[PDB]
Amino acid sequence: TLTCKEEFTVNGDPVKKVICTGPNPRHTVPQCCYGFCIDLLIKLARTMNFTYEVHLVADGVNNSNKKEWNGMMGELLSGQADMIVAPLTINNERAQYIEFSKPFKYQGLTILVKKEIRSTLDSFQPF
Amino acid sequence: RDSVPCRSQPEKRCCKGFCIDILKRLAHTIGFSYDLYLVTNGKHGKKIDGVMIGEVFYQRADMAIGSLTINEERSEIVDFSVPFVETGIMVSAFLEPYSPAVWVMMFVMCLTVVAVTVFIFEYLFTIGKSIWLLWALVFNNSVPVTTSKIMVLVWAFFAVIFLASYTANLAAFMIQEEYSGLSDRKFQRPQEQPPLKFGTVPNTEKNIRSNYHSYMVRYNQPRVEEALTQLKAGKFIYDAAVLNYMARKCKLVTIGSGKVFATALHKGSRWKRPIDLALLQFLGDDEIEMLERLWLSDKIEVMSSKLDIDNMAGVFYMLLVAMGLSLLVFAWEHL
Amino acid sequence: LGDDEIEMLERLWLSDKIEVMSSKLDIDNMAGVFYMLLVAMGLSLL
Amino acid sequence: MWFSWGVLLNSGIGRILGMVWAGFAMIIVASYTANLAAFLVLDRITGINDPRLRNPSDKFIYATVKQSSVDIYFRRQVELSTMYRHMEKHNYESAAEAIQAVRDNKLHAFIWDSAVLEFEASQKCDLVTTGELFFRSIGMRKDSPWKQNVSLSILKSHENGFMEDLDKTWVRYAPATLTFENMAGVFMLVAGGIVAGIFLIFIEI
Amino acid sequence: QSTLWLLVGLSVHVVAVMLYLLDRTLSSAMWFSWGVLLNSGIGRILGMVWAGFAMIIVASYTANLAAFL
Numbered sequence: 001t002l003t004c005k006e007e008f009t010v011n012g013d014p015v016k017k018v019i020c021t022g023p024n025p026r027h028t029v030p031q032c033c034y035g036f037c038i039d040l041l042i043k044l045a046r047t048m049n050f051t052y053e054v055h056l057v058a059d060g061v062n063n064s065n066k067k068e069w070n071g072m073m074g075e076l077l078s079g080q081a082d083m084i085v086a087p088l089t090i091n092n093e094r095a096q097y098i099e100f101s102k103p104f105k106y107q108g109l110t111i112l113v114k115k116e117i118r119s120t121l122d123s124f125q126p127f
Numbered sequence: 128r129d130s131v132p133c134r135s136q137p138e139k140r141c142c143k144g145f146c147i148d149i150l151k152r153l154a155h156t157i158g159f160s161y162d163l164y165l166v167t168n169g170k171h172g173k174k175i176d177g178v179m180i181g182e183v184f185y186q187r188a189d190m191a192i193g194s195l196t197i198n199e200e201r202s203e204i205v206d207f208s209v210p211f212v213e214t215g216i217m218v219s220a221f222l223e224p225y226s227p228a229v230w231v232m233m234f235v236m237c238l239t240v241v242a243v244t245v246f247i248f249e250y251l252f253t254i255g256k257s258i259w260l261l262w263a264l265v266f267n268n269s270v271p272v273t274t275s276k277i278m279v280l281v282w283a284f285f286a287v288i289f290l291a292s293y294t295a296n297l298a299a300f301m302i303q304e305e306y307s308g309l310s311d312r313k314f315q316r317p318q319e320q321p322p323l324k325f326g327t328v329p330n331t332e333k334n335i336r337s338n339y340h341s342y343m344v345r346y347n348q349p350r351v352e353e354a355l356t357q358l359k360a361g362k363f364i365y366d367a368a369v370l371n372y373m374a375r376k377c378k379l380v381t382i383g384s385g386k387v388f389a390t391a392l393h394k395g396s397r398w399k400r401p402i403d404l405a406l407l408q409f410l411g412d413d414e415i416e417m418l419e420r421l422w423l424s425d426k427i428e429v430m431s432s433k434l435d436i437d438n439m440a441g442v443f444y445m446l447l448v449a450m451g452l453s454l455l456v457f458a459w460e461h462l
Numbered sequence: 463l464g465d466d467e468i469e470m471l472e473r474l475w476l477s478d479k480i481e482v483m484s485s486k487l488d489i490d491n492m493a494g495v496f497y498m499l500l501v502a503m504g505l506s507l508l
Numbered sequence: 509m510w511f512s513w514g515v516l517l518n519s520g521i522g523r524i525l526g527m528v529w530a531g532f533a534m535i536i537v538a539s540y541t542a543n544l545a546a547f548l549v550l551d552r553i554t555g556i557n558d559p560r561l562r563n564p565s566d567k568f569i570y571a572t573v574k575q576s577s578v579d580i581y582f583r584r585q586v587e588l589s590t591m592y593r594h595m596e597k598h599n600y601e602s603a604a605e606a607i608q609a610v611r612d613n614k615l616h617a618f619i620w621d622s623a624v625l626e627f628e629a630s631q632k633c634d635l636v637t638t639g640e641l642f643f644r645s646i647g648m649r650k651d652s653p654w655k656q657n658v659s660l661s662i663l664k665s666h667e668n669g670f671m672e673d674l675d676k677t678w679v680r681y682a683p684a685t686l687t688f689e690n691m692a693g694v695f696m697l698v699a700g701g702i703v704a705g706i707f708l709i710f711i712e713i
Numbered sequence: 714q715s716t717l718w719l720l721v722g723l724s725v726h727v728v729a730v731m732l733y734l735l736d737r738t739l740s741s742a743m744w745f746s747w748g749v750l751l752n753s754g755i756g757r758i759l760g761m762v763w764a765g766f767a768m769i770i771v772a773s774y775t776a777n778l779a780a781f782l
């Protein structure tokens with residue numbers, strides 16, 4: 001930001017982008033964050049008049065083996081409310097950990113690659 | 128084998144299915160007894176007027192296996208966490224000759240051939256004749272009509288080579304295969320129908336009935352049974368999961384997963400989290416192969432009049448432009 | 463064994479029509495070259 | 509010799525048994541064209557079943573994430589240990605990092621959520637995706653009743669509509685003619701013709 | 714069989730108009746064009762232009778044969 005930039009969306013209505021603070025050493029970056037998930041959070045808050053906030057995450061039993069997860073464990077330890085941003089993991093372990101709400105969307109897993117291409121070898125040959 | 132005791136309400140009948148398979152797998156994972164009752168009232172036993180199937184009352188039943196979708200009003204009374212399809216959503220011309228900047232070699236070769244002709248009319252009285260020879264020869268061998276012969280020999284060589292390359296390119300071209308989401312309607316078309324192609328009224332269906340008047344509330348249950356649609360192929364929308372199941376069964380039907388426009392237990396507490404954890408822990412591995420094997424389970428083209436529309440792609444462009452150019456020089460040079 | 467064992471082994475462990483060109487074209491066209499050439503030579507010479 | 513040379517090369521620029529000779533010409537030409545057609549006729553994992561993804565591969569890279577969710581999903585299947593082994597060397601901070609890394613083709617492929625890759629490829633009109641979803645699958649602490657509301661919040665058809673609106677908002681964004689080497693062939697042929705013409709003028713005087 | 718007959722008729726008409734207004738025959742021109750359209754030698758500022766289409770159309774036909782092949 002400069003304060004967050006204001007710009008009309010493709011349809012013309014403004015595209016919300018709320019002040020969102022967290023790590024980018026140790027320096028706190030109060031950037032501006034936006035996305036469909038943010039809009040969903042806005043809808044929820046308008047539905048139950050929440051007083052929301054936000055906080056970026058640091059990252060995505062001999063000595064330490066269990067309490068090491070970033071998203072779920074970080075949310076539980078840091079005291080952040082039950083609100084979480086991205087679907088990320090949806091499994092039994094994270095479920096028993098805290099909870100899983102009804103799936104806002106149904107998704108799976110796939111792969112992305114670089115598409116191939118080039119004809120050669122006229123052989124119209126040296127013979 | 129693998130069936131289950133099953134009664135509806137003193138006669139018992141063979142009873143089993145994918146729902147039964149998942150129920151028994153869950154029971155084994157939890158070692159819980161059960162009773163496989165059956166519907167008695169209505170096709171869904173819904174709380175139509177404040178009277179789901181077994182939970183129309185508060186605690187009439189103790190489970191829920193109805194494959195029908197999960198709603199708000201249905202869900203807001205009893206938790207019904209479960210995974211399934213969610214049944215959301217339903218029912219060469221230009222590149223013929225070649226690319227332009229590939230045969231520039233042919234233009235330059237025409238110029239060099241012309242020059243070579245200029246290099247032969249003082250070596251042993253034929254320019255217009257030589258000009259016609261060149262022009263009519265520029266094309267394939269089919270034509271009505273010692274450097275002198277060597278130049279023609281090399282000319283024919285790369286001409287036939289280019290023709291063979293064109294044959295290979297068109298062989299690649301012809302080898303080709305073949306076979307719309309904006310909203311719940313038919314690609315932003317009017318709410319209901321412009322009264323053409325009427326359908327999608329199966330009377331789930333109530334879920335879209337309360338939607339933004341459900342095609343003018345013009346659903347008199349024309350669909351009736353789903354299989355009745357078999358005749359209706361090219362003379363429709365419904366629960367997408369069952370639509371896909373019918374599609375699996377020829378009858379090509381609109382099948383779009385991305386669309387998903389429209390998107391299992393009683394209210395008894397102390398049962399949601401257990402089975403939810405059980406499925407989230409074990410389901411992820413077995414469940415897909417289980418369903419597909421147990422249940423819920425083309426580049427070919429010959430010929431048509433498509434050849435006519437295809438050669439029309441490379442017919443008019445030449446014929447009409449030639450007519451225009453010829454007529455332009457017909458009424459122009461004559462004065 | 464009869465059920466699991468084969469998939470077990472193959473997954474766990476224990477796990478072409480393409481041709482471009484060659485001088486095969488010469489031996490190939492020799493298939494339909496000599497038969498005509500030599501027979502024509504003899505038929506003309508007789 | 510000149511007449512025969514012309515005859516052998518399909519041009520009209522040019523007797524009890526001569527026709528017999530003509531015979532071979534026809535077939536040989538066909539043969540040549542046939543081989544051209546034989547030359548003319550020719551030609552990813554496209555699913556987890558691809559052995560390259562399953563069997564170890566030095567070249568092919570089955571990229572992974574930083575033990576977020578895929579690690580758990582793969583630890584269930586023991587056979588993926590080798591892949592999990594590769595997972596030890598294919599765990600990066602963010603999916604954007606993996607995308608940027610593979611843009612250069614250093615990593616053959618990466619496995620991730622269907623939607624994320626789908627819309628990134630939508631943005632990335634330069635790459636190719638495989639689709640073929642295979643593992644169809646907001647949280648909260650177990651002390652907030654708001655959970656129900658949240659579920660109730662999203663269950664609405666007027667809500668699925670907002671999701672579709674977001675989808676509209678975000679998801680909105682082989683001739684191979686030989687020609688070139690054929691070009692070189694024609695250029696060297698015209699060079700041969702030029703030198704032949706120089707020879708012809710040399711013999712002329 | 715429509716394309717062949719219609720195109721040969723059109724070519725006969727165009728060559729006939731080319732000759733008639735430049736000759737002051739129709740059947741002789743029609744026969745010559747019919748022969749030209751069918752790859753035989755049994756048979757002028759812009760006539761070559763017509764010749765053009767011949768080549769490509771033949772290829773097209775053969776192409777479909779290969780597509781059929």
Ligand SMILES: CC1=C(CC[C@H](C)CO[C@@H]2O[C@H](CO)[C@@H](O)[C@H](O)[C@H]2O)O[C@H]2C[C@@H]3[C@H]4CC[C@]5(C)C[C@@H](O)CC[C@]5(C)[C@H]4CC[C@]3(C)[C@@H]12
Binds near residue numbers: 227
């Ligand atoms: C070998 C040739 C091609 C090939 C092109 C194809 C026929 C198809 O046409 C191409 O289609 C592509 C795909 O749409 C487009 O991208 C291209 O714009 C378009 O050129 O052009 C032709 C035009 C020219 C004629 C027209 C008359 C003149 C211009 C002047 C007269 O005094 C007599 C001489 C001359 C130069 C005459 C001689 C031959 C020629 C150079 C012709």
Ligand SMILES: *[C@@H]1O[C@H](CO)[C@@H](O)[C@H](O)[C@H]1NC(C)=O
Binds near residue numbers: 048049050
């Ligand atoms: C809106 O939220 C506020 C919280 O301060 C609450 O007092 C109020 O009752 C809410 N209004 C409605 C209509 O829910």
